[PDB]
Motif scaffolding. Structure first.
Motif, PDB file in Angstrom:
ATOM      1  N   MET A  60       8.716  10.078  -0.506  1.00 25.49           N
ATOM      2  CA  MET A  60       9.302   9.233   0.646  1.00 25.49           C
ATOM      3  C   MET A  60      10.392   9.973   1.534  1.00 25.49           C
ATOM      4  O   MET A  60      10.584   9.608   2.530  1.00 25.49           O
ATOM      5  N   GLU A  76       0.792  -1.087   0.042  1.00 25.61           N
ATOM      6  CA  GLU A  76       0.051   0.055   0.227  1.00 25.61           C
ATOM      7  C   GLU A  76       1.063   1.266  -0.098  1.00 25.61           C
ATOM      8  O   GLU A  76       0.476   2.412  -0.052  1.00 25.61           O
ATOM      9  N   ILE A  77       2.428   1.204  -0.027  1.00 26.47           N
ATOM     10  CA  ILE A  77       3.178   1.956  -0.377  1.00 26.47           C
ATOM     11  C   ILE A  77       2.980   2.157  -1.826  1.00 26.47           C
ATOM     12  O   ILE A  77       3.540   1.121  -2.653  1.00 26.47           O
ATOM     13  N   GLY A  78       2.356   3.241  -2.330  1.00 27.76           N
ATOM     14  CA  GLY A  78       1.779   3.456  -3.326  1.00 27.76           C
ATOM     15  C   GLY A  78       2.781   3.654  -4.606  1.00 27.76           C
ATOM     16  O   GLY A  78       2.287   4.316  -5.598  1.00 27.76           O
ATOM     17  N   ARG A  79       3.992   2.921  -4.664  1.00 28.42           N
ATOM     18  CA  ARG A  79       4.985   3.310  -5.856  1.00 28.42           C
ATOM     19  C   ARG A  79       5.204   4.690  -6.016  1.00 28.42           C
ATOM     20  O   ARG A  79       4.800   5.290  -6.805  1.00 28.42           O
ATOM     21  N   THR A  80       5.488   5.333  -4.729  1.00 25.32           N
ATOM     22  CA  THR A  80       5.467   6.966  -4.783  1.00 25.32           C
ATOM     23  C   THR A  80       6.703   7.289  -5.512  1.00 25.32           C
ATOM     24  O   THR A  80       7.867   7.443  -4.632  1.00 25.32           O
TER      25      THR A  80
END
Ligand SMILES: [Mg+2]
Ligand SMILES: [Zn+2]
Lengths: 34, 653, 1340
Positions: free
Chosen positions: A11, A1-5
């Motif tokens: 980050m 759910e670390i939304g490929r930021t």
RNA sequence: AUAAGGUGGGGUUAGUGA
């Protein structure tokens, strides 16, 4: 759910948000250690 | 590069190289200072996005821009896409020794030559001017020749007059779809500055004179001049590569002139006298003593090569017109007479030229084609074929047929008023009776037009075909059809709706009268939908060809004969009704797989490895052969190629 | 009855339908829009005050510092228009705004401010417009096109069919705000209501319901009906309205009152529902297994344990019915379900949401919107407020509120700008209803959903962007606001504002350049409606349907006029009669039609309000009473034409022209042709180029007065008057007394525009069309501008034409022409180029302008002045030198040691180079004007001094004539005071006019008027000097330039261009043509009378390209020429006024019912004569669009002439000298030439410059470049066997430096021998990917 | 041979009758 930021800013905020703000007397405490 | 002034149009690549080594050096000094892992961690991530931002910008989640908030160009898009180097600068390059301007006609040329303007010639051949100008010693050194070709001294017109004696050039039209878009010519210098062009090339180019520009090129070297005159030269290509039909068919108005030539009103000047030879017929015409479209039993004489190519004289007293005997003088020797004994529509003259190529080789077909162009414009101009508003004739029954039709939709409509019928049933019956009445108007105007001429003939009365200008222009096959004149005189159609369905009230009016508001409004719906479809359809069609030219790309006829016995079986195709494509064209010019067993039970008609030209096709055509196994390219056993005996004919040679 | 001026050439008109309402003013969209942009309007809507009051007052970051608004006041421009066209400035006015700044005291946001201040501070400039509506930005003339875009509001769509290939439609609901975040609702094939925000990822809708602080029983309360089971005697008997029994089969033997109504096996019919409700019972019994199929509505909890028995949105089990059966909860609430009627859709949407409370729902909103960061309470909360509930970050327009309340069937059209809960809940109800089957989705192309913008809306929007960004700055500087030291221009920077607005008018998708080669060019370029641009479509991803016409386009958008090419139908043009709404929709005119009477009032209709009514079509024969003579009449109800009754109708069309634009209202006989050639007729008709000698068209369409007037390229008399002084340059009108203002009597002086460069490099020029000593009318033409004649618009010329094939020079569409045409020089136009020569001051010194040059001959030196500049009017050729510019390479400018040794040795040294401005190659022409601009503080040159004093002398001539005339008005007023109170008519003029105060006059207000007119005399003197001297300060000064240039010299070169074989010229029916052969006179066809024909077209273009209106036009032109030359036949022959009077009286009667109805008897026998020589070259004939003349009238008018009725005259060839059989059609066609002349299309290149990144020749013509050999003709080459050709041409002729140099040597040595080498572009390719991380090599 | 020359945006031209 670390939304490929893919923003590195996002980050980078996620790491710098770990440490909280120190008061100015804690600077006396740390610069004392210095 | 600099732009105009002290500023500088940057490159993207220099920008991101600046970014990446700034990134690197800052990371080095950070490693020197022993920073915490947060910082150098972040910086290494910055170097990661820096480097891939060099390689392929945009494949990473957000791209980067320098200015105009517009994503800058990496190395990856410098290769891909419509302007990366492959399609941009590797397959299609910009070329020196070229010119470009607007085409026009000048019909006085022969077809192995084209017009060319003096200014573009004097620009394109400047190094040749330098070369021969050095040779004659009119100027020794080069810069002398520079100012001679600049200052325009009178001697150079002799010189480029000389060096364009037999040097071929190329022409190009921009939508170069199939390979007839490039043909070669021999330039004849023209006062003025547009490019004059022989008329029969225009249909091959599909280049109307509405303002199309063409570009030219010059083969410089010697071998390429030989490739031009050998292959690119326009007298070579007369048959399509798609099929054996001629593509040097006369286009539109010469066929009007010749159709006007071989026709006959039923009583005219010099009606039915006698004459010994077509020269006398020419004297009768230009002396103005008999009509052009007037029948007279004459003597003519012809030739044929039934023997070993041997041409034999024989003669009689044919009954014919005047003008048939007139253009008989242009036809070369080896033809039957009855090729010209009819009204000569576009089809008849087309297969006339075709059989002229099949029987008399190349050159008489060529010079014959030029000559029929000359007499085509001569008698077309002397004909005087106009148009008039009085030429379009309204059928008087139109009003009544529409009247009974609207009575019938009143009847089905009152069946829906009390609701005896459903919606779609009233819909379908109304649209059917409009179809039927529409057809009644269609053959109404046709029957009114086609044979309206009713005249005496040394007697009381007689009908014949019409001398109306429209009916000649549609009947000869020049432009248009029964459908378009149907849209002129009779009512026009049932236009569709934006849904793709069809509107229940037809456009009752016609173009000779006035359309209303809304009929015109419906019509411009149909037209806009039409040409929009042409735009996006063009866009897809180019992509189709662009694709499958790449997948073939590589197949070269490289061997003589594979020596195999496989292949496919050709039959005439039948839809389920009529034969819609016969046998003899699917077979024509493809070498068989096995031998043709005649249906005489155990007779060999044609051997197993033969070319089937027209004589053989007539031979098994007579014996009603139904199927022939033939050699195909799918069965050619050649490595990295195709043997010629599995392929067959050139179709232009 | 007419003007006096209209009687110079009255036009014969056909047309049965009486016009009831004329054309409007044509430029009305631009003018009322940008007019509404700047004015002092109260009450906010709509304008600049909406911007300022929308954002002001603005407080600090709770530091109790706050600035507010007072007013704005926009100053005058520093420059006029045409000088700003000369120099290059923005024609733009300053913006002065009175703000007000206060500062509250501490412990007092509410308290008294301690200090106030107020100044009127400056914020940049905005351009004005001209009264021709254009803008002027940097010397140029630019036009902003209004944008069509989707109205903000809420919409409903299917996206039927093609998605998921399952045969099932979807339904989705979309909200479009005016400014903010999108919000979309939709379903799935598994039928759950999903929502996404700004086109992002998908979420179920009930999470946004819980986000709006709603509990579950509130949700199921709203979206459903309460269905009532109650614990009763046994098995939980049922309360029932038998309406719910529709559409379902009796699952049990449904029975009541001990009576069986519907058994198992029967669906309960409406007959059976009528049985039940006829008995009218609700308390029935179901068996208990009917309840296990049900879902409980509310939450019944346990009483003793206080615990949840059963939650909402879960299917009952009979054991749960036992758990509640032992509970004693008598009520049981459930919901209604019918998949036919009321599907329980949002129930499962509450199943798939994993969330419970307000707060978590806020978390996943915060996590889907800003992905990848840890959640925080107030970031989620305030974020969610800032998506829909922010007066800053979200707005619907009042238009959007209107569409909204209309869309969900509310009542009042106004409301909030942000939205609330009940909005969203109602939207979900509506989308549920379309899912059920009531209501319908709406097509987008319906014109009630497309809104036009305009100029002032967009300039307002960009201005708002600038204000809020500069306000981010101001709030920053204010929250750190040190008190009592800041005046409100340290917070305010005008550079963000002016940067934003000049960014807008500089580079937009909609601020596109104006084409100026035609009055019709600009007049259709201003009424353009684009759908591109910001917030708009792209030219490559629109469907067919948005390009298609829609039956709401009728009367509002022109159907037929669109640009052909890559964007067809996206660039639609507006109709004639259409105006815009208050709100921005397309209102259209109609006639009010009562009971049987068509009322002659007009009445405007929107798009969606039209559809309720029924419309009488224009060409319906009513008979003088409002009463249509028929009883059925063609009308349209809802996008369909059908025959309706005599009394059903509601409204009538205004006129027969409202369906079309002005772009085709000029087409005569438009109804007789196909739409394709009509479209090509309009778009090619736009591109026509003005001629030298303008000429009226015979077959006119009645619109030519309107478009000629409303194009301001003519100069119209602003007041009615009498001509005093005619000149070629200026024109002087004595004003009539009635229109003369009581104070400031004055006269009218108009200055005509002479030869100046257009946008498209063509000659725009104005000519006087009036005589001297002549009454004029207010609102009448005075100057024929370019392609305007006598107040009428006229593009090209009209000529004799005939239809026959002639020796193949008219083979396809090529046009043969006679030599007579070019001998009359009647297609020759004028082209004007502008060339410049700069003067930069670099290092190593400045640059010089003088005639000193190194090493050219005296030939170019002959044609300069002493200053190095060509004289005005010296005809030059290509390669000539206009201005000798040199650089001092090697100038020193050193220390006084240098200047010492220069004084010692002399000044000989430091002279080299040359960069003279040379004429481009192949062009020639005539210099007509020199402009010099000089940077300030730089010494002006001699020729600049002469042109400078010449402008000066002109200016003082103008003001001197002004003071002469107004002085004559004042002292002549003084004679008009010395009539009464001591007239001395002998003693007034003895001394000159100055001492007219001091004659014998009493001590009254008249001698006082002598004194205040000596005052007004004195401010004429003093004000005259200060205006003249201010003009000297304008022209004398050194003007600003680009940084780093010393002086710019502009040169205007003038070219005459005639015609040449290869030019494109065309008629008005899509009949194009390239002109093929200029053939001498003697070879033309010619009649028995002997007259040549002039142009021979081709008959084959007619039946295929069906445009029969050209030949109808041709016949009518034949008739008109027959009349005019019949007149002139009676006129060069001497003849009295009577026969001409009778004859042309007959020639204006002409058969059927017209609107014309004029007589000659009311005339002066001299305007009879003047109109007679205006008619000797033809008779102007009008024709309306659909109510034009018929065949019987044109045969009748040919019959008035002596021409034969068929119109097909016999001919004779000039070469044979004998008759063509089958006599052919002749007549007069009005034809144009277009600006695709062959002179700039013809181009070649032997060997020129090369590009540098690849050694390849450049592209284009201006860069002297070669052609592209595209890859398709490459395929054509290897389609042949041509092997050497493409290797040579692909390599030597293009790419290798070595091969082209050596082959160049071999040609100049007479060898033909190619050398392959290797293409350079391959080399840059593989060293490119070699610079990429790829080892690629060439092997052995 | 001293007119040269990248990147965006806009406008236009030429591309069927069944
Ligand atoms: Mg064309
Ligand atoms: Zn083979």
């Amino acid at each position: 759910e670390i939304g490929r930021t893919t923003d590195p800013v996002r980050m980078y905020m996620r790491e710098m948000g770990t440490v909280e703000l120190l008061t100015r007397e804690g600077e006396i405490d740390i610069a004392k250690r210095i | 590069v600099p732009l105009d002034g002290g500023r500088f149009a940057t490159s993207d690549l220099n920008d991101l190289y600046r970014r990446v080594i700034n990134r690197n050096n800052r990371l080095k000094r950070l490693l020197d200072l022993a920073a915490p892992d947060i910082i150098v961690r972040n910086e290494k991530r910055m170097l990661q996005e820096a480097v891939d931002a060099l390689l392929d910008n945009g494949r990473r989640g957000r791209a980067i821009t320098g200015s105009n908030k517009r994503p800058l160009k990496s190395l990856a898009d410098m290769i891909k896409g419509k302007q990366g180097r492959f399609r941009q600068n590797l397959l299609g390059k910009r070329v020196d020794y070229s010119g470009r301007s607007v085409i026009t006609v000048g019909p006085y040329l022969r077809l192995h030559q084209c017009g060319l303007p003096k200014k573009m010639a004097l620009e394109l051949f400047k190094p040749f001017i330098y070369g021969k100008l050095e040779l004659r010693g009119l100027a020794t050194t080069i810069k002398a020749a520079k100012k001679m070709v600049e200052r325009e001294e009178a001697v150079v017109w002799d010189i480029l007059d000389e060096v364009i004696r037999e040097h071929p050039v190329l022409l190009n039209r921009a939508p170069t779809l199939h390979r007839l878009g490039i043909q070669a010519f021999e330039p004849v210098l023209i006062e003025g500055k547009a490019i004059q062009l022989h008329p029969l090339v225009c249909a091959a180019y599909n280049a109307d004179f509405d303002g199309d520009q063409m570009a030219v090129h010059v083969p410089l070297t010697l071998e390429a001049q030989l490739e031009a005159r050998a292959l690119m030269m326009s007298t070579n290509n007369i048959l399509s590569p798609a099929n054996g039909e001629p593509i040097i068919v006369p286009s539109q108005d010469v066929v009007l002139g010749l159709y006007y030539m071989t026709r006959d009103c039923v009583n005219a000047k010099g009606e039915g006298m006698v004459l010994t030879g077509p020269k006398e017929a020419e004297r009768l015409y230009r002396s103005g003593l008999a009509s052009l479209h007037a029948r007279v039993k004459v003597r003519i004489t012809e030739y044929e090569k039934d023997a070993n190519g041997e041409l034999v004289a024989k003669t009689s007293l044919k009954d014919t017109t005047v003008g048939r005997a007139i253009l008989w003088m242009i036809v070369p020797k080896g033809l039957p007479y009855s090729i010209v004994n009819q009204a000569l529509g576009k089809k008849a003259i087309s297969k006339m030229l075709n059989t002229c190529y099949r029987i008399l080789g190349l050159k008489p077909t060529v010079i014959f084609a030029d000559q029929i162009m000359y007499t085509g414009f001569a008698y077309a101009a002397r004909s005087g074929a106009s148009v008039g508003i009085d030429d379009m004739v309204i059928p008087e029954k139109k009003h009544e047929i529409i009247s009974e039709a609207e009575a019938e939709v009143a009847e089905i409509q009152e069946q829906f008023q009390s609701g005896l019928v459903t919606a779609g049933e009233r819909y379908n019956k109304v649209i059917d009776i409009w179809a039927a009445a529409n057809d009644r108007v269609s053959k109404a105007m046709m029957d009114n037009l086609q044979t309206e001429t009713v005249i005496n003939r040394d007697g009381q009365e007689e009908k014949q075909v019409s001398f109306n200008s429209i009916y000649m222009m549609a009947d000869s096959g020049a432009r248009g059809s029964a459908a378009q004149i149907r849209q002129l005189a009779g009512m026009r159609g049932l236009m569709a709706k934006p849904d793709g369905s069809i509107i229940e009230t037809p456009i009752t009016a016609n173009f000779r009268e006035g359309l209303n508001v809304l009929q015109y409004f419906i019509s411009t719906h149909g037209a806009r939908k039409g040409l929009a479809d042409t735009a996006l359809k063009t866009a897809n069609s180019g992509y189709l060809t662009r694709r499958l030219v790449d997948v073939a790309q590589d197949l070269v006829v490289t061997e003589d004969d594979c020596g195999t016995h496989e292949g496919i079986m050709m039959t005439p195709v039948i839809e389920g009704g009529d034969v819609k494509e016969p046998l003899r064209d699917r077979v024509l010019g493809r070498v068989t797989a096995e031998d043709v067993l005649k249906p005489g039970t155990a007779d060999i008609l044609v051997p197993r490895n033969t070319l089937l030209h027209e004589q053989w096709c007539d031979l098994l055509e007579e014996n009603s052969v139904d199927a022939v196994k033939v050699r195909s390219v799918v069965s050619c056993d050649t490595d990295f190629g195709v043997c010629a005996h599995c392929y067959g004919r050139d179709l232009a040679r | 009855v007419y003007s006096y001026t209209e009687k110079k050439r009255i036009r014969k008109d056909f047309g049965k339908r009486p016009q009831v309402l004329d054309v409007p003013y044509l430029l009305s969209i631009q003018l009322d829009s940008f007019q509404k942009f700047i004015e002092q309007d109260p009450e906010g809507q709509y304008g600049l005050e909406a911007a300022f009051r929308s954002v002001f007052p603005i407080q600090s970051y709770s530091g109790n510092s706050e600035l507010q608004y007072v007013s704005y006041r926009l100053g005058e421009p520093v420059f006029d228009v045409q000088e700003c066209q000369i120099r290059g400035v923005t024609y733009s006015a300053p913006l002065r705004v009175k703000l007000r700044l206060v500062i509250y005291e501490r412990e007092a946001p509410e308290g008294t401010v301690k200090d106030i201040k107020e100044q009127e501070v400056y914020m940049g400039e905005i351009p004005l417009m001209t009264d021709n509506g254009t803008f002027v930005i940097n010397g140029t003339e630019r036009v902003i096109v209004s944008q069509l875009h989707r109205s903000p509001g809420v919409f409903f769509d299917s996206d039927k069919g093609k998605t998921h290939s399952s045969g099932k439609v979807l339904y989705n609901a979309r909200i479009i705000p005016y400014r903010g975040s999108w919000l979309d609702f939709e379903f799935d094939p598994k039928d759950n209501l999903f929502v996404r925000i700004d086109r992002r990822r998908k979420l179920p809708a009930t999470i946004i319901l819980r986000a709006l602080n709603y509990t579950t029983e509130q949700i199921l309360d709203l979206f459903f009906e309460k269905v009532i089971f109650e614990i009763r005697d046994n098995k939980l008997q049922m309360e029932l309205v038998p309406e719910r029994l529709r559409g379902e089969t009796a699952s049990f033997d449904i029975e009541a009152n001990g009576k069986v109504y519907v058994e198992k096996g029967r669906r309960i019919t409406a007959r059976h529902i009528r049985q039940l409700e006829k008995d009218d019972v609700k308390l029935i019994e179901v068996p208990v297994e009917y309840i296990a199929g049900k879902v409980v509505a509310k939450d019944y909890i346990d009483e003793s344990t206080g615990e949840l028995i059963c939650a909402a949105n879960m299917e009952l089990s009979l054991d749960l019915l036992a758990k509640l059966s032992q509970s004693g909860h008598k009520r049981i609430e459930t919901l209604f379900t019918n998949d036919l009627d009321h599907g329980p859709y949002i129930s499962e949407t509450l199943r798939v949401d994993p969330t419970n409370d307000r707060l978590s729902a806020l978390v996943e909103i915060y996590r889907m919107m800003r992905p990848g960061e840890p959640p925080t309470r107030e970031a989620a909360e305030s974020l969610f407020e800032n998506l829909f509930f922010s007066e800053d970050r979200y707005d619907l327009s009042a238009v959007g509120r209107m569409k909204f309340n209309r869309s969900l069937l509310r009542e009042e059209i106004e409301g909030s700008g942000i939205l609330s809960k009940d909005d969203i809940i109602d939207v979900m109800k509506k989308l549920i209803d379309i899912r059920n089957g009531k209501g319908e989705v709406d097509d987008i192309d319906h014109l009630g959903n497309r809104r036009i913008r305009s100029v002032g809306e967009m300039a307002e929007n960009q201005f708002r962007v600038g204000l809020v960004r500069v306000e981010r700055a101001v709030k920053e500087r204010l929250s750190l606001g040190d008190l009592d030291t800041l005046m409100p221009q340290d917070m305010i920077n005008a550079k963000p504002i002016s940067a934003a607005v000049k960014e807008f008018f500089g580079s937009s998708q909609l601020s596109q350049f104006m084409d100026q080669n035609n009055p019709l060019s600009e007049i259709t370029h201003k009424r353009r409606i684009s759908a591109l641009g910001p917030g708009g479509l792209t030219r490559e991803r629109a469907g067919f349907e948005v390009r298609d016409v829609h039956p709401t386009h009728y009367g509002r958008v022109c159907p037929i006029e669109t640009p052909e090419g890559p964007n067809i139908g996206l660039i639609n043009s507006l109709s004639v009669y259409a105006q815009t709404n208050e709100y921005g929709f397309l209102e259209t005119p109609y006639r009010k039609v009562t009971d049987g009477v068509v009322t002659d009032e007009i009445h405007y209709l929107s798009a969606i309000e039209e559809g309720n009514y029924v419309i009488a079509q224009a060409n319906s024969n009513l008979d003088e009473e409002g009463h249509f003579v028929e009883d059925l009449v063609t009308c349209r109800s809802k996008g369909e034409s059908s025959l309706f009754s005599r009394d059903q109708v509601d409204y009538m069309d205004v006129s027969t022209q409202q369906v079309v634009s002005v772009g085709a209202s000029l087409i005569p006989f438009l109804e007789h042709d196909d739409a394709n050639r009509a479209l090509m007729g309009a778009n090619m008709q736009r591109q026509a180029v003005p001629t030298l000698r303008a000429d009226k068209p015979l077959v006119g369409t009645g619109m030519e007065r309107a478009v000629a007037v409303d194009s301001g390229v003519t100069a119209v008399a602003k007041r009615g008057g009498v001509v005093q002084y005619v000149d070629a340059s200026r024109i002087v009108i004595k004003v009539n007394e009635d229109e003369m203002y009581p104070g400031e009597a004055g006269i009218d002086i108009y200055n005509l525009t002479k030869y100046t460069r257009s946008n498209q490099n063509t000659c725009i020029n104005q000519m006087p069309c009036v005589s001297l000593g002549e009454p004029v009318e207010r609102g009448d033409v005075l100057a024929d501008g370019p392609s305007t004649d006598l107040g009428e618009l006229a593009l090209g010329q009209n000529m004799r034409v005939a239809f026959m094939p002639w020796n193949g020079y008219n083979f396809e569409d090529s046009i043969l022409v006679s030599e007579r045409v070019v001998q009359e020089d009647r297609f020759t136009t004028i082209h004007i180029q502008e060339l410049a020569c700069v003067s930069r001051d670099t290092k190593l010194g400045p640059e010089e302008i003088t005639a000193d040059i190194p090493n050219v001959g005296e030939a170019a030196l002959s044609k300069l002045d002493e200053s190095g500049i060509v004289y005005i009017g010296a005809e030059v050729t290509g390669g000539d030198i206009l201005v000798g510019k040199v650089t001092p390479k090697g100038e020193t400018q050193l220390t006084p040691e240098e200047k010492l040794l220069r004084a010692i040795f002399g000044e000989k040294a430091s002279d080299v180079k040359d960069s003279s401005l040379r004429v481009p190659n192949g062009v020639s022409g005539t210099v007509i004007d020199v402009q010099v601009f000089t940077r300030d503080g730089v010494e002006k040159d001699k020729r600049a001094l002469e042109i400078e004093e010449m402008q000066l002398k002109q200016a003082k001539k103008d003001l001197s004539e002004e003071l002469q005339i107004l002085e004559a008005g004042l002292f002549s007023r003084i004679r008009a005071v010395l009539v009464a109170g001591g007239v001395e008519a002998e003693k007034l003029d003895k001394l000159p006019r100055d001492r007219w105060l001091e004659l014998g006059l009493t001590d009254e207000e008249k001698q006082n008027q002598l004194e205040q007119l000596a005052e007004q005399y004195d401010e004429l003197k003093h004000e005259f000097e200060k205006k003249l001297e201010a003009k000297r300060r304008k022209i004398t000064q050194g003007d600003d330039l680009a940084p780093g240039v010393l002086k710019i010299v502009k040169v205007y070169l003038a070219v005459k261009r005639r015609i040449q074989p290869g030019d494109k010229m065309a008629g008005r029916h899509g009949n194009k043509g390239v002109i093929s052969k200029i053939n001498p006179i003697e070879d033309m066809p010619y009649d028995e009378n002997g007259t040549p024909v002039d142009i021979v077209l081709n008959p084959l273009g007619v039946p295929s390209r069906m445009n029969i209106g050209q030949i109808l036009e041709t016949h009518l032109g034949m008739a008109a020429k027959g009349i005019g030359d019949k007149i002139n036949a009676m006129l060069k022959q001497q003849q009295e006024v009577a026969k001409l009077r009778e004859f042309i009286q007959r020639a204006y009667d002409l058969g059927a019912d017209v609107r014309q109805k004029v007589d000659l008897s009311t005339f002066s026998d001299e305007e009879v004569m003047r109109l007679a020589e205006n008619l000797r070259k033809g008779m102007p004939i009008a024709t309306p669009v659909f109510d034009g003349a018929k065949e019987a009238e044109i045969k009748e008018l040919l019959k008035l002439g002596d021409l034969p009725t068929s119109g097909q005259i016999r001919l004779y060839d000039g070469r044979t000298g004998e008759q063509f059989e089958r006599p052919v059609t002749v007549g007069y066609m009005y034809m144009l030439k277009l600006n695709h002349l062959v002179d700039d299309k013809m181009h070649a290149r032997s060997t020129g410059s090369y590009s540098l990144v690849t050694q390849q020749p450049l592209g284009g013509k201006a860069q002297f470049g070669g052609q592209r050999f595209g890859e398709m003709e490459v395929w054509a080459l290897e389609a042949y066997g041509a092997a050497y050709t493409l290797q040579e041409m692909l390599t030597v002729k293009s790419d290798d430096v070595n091969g082209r140099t050596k082959m160049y040597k071999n040609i100049v040595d007479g060898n033909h021998q190619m050398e392959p080498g290797m293409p350079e572009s391959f080399n840059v390719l593989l060293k490119e990917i070699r610079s990429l991380g790829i080892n690629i090599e060439l092997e052995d």
